[PDB]
Design a protein around this ligand. Structure first.
Ligand code: NA
Ligand code: NA
Ligand code: NA
Lengths: 151, 148
């Protein structure tokens, strides 16, 4: 696991809370064997090109969590300015205004909100970023089509 | 406007009974076309700890178009104009007439986390976010201290 013992206890508390009282459109599926590898699903919000899809993702809690944010991957394929070719979520997404008081609930809200409002100024998917900024309806069409297949 | 009154009533009932996290609605039966709301500034943003009062103005062409939104709490945010008006182009993105007040409110809450400076109504906040993020955040946090 490689987390300080009181951090493991805080993570256990938080994930157990998120299983019992999940945020809207988010589900967490903890594995008690390893709480640092967290499977999550986020519903694509209505009013976005991801509407109707279920987006599987993984959070990896590194040894410095929560001084540092976790790493996040989309396991569901997605056409999103801030999601790289291997599914990695752009590190500035979670680093911006990150403090050690933040946890998994914050990460998950930040990622869900990123589906509504990408940040194309820092696009890892340069094609998706350019389309969003320059021809929004074409970005949306491409993201919708991939959601139809993969979500 | 009759249709507006009918539509707002059903959704407002659900939003009062089962509000989204961080969001509260305060309907006034006298006029359901003008809807007062609060949104908690999310943690992990320059708005953290603030309570943001806002209102929606539902026009006669709702839900073909999104409602107009205003922040009533003063805010330093790329997508919020001098008079508190919330950028219409942002609320229009992927808008269709099956959408309602819940989507609008989630869209605005999530805009506090991820501004869209490419369409900044507040040119200074948009430029600072892109070119001097720490100054943007400092300015927004200081205003949240006073107004939130
Ligand atoms: Na939007
Ligand atoms: Na942010
Ligand atoms: Na953005």
């Amino acid at each position: 696991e490689n987390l300080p013992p009181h951090i493991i206890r805080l993570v256990y508390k938080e994930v157990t809370t998120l299983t019992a009282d999940p945020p809207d459109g988010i589900k967490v599926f903890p594995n008690e064997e390893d709480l640092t590898d967290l499977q999550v699903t986020i519903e694509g919000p209505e009013g976005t090109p991801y509407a109707g899809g279920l987006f599987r993702m993984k959070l990896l809690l590194g040894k410095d969590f929560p001084a540092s944010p976790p790493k996040g991957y989309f396991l569901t394929k997605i056409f999103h300015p801030n999601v790289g070719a291997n599914g990695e979520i752009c590190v500035n997404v979670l680093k911006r205004d990150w403090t050690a008081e933040l946890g998994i609930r914050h990460v998950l809200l930040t990622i869900k909100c990123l589906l509504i409002h990408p940040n194309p100024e820092s696009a890892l998917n340069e094609e998706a970023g350019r389309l969003l900024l320059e021809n929004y309806e074409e970005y949306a069409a491409r993201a919708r089509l991939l959601t139809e297949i993969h979500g």
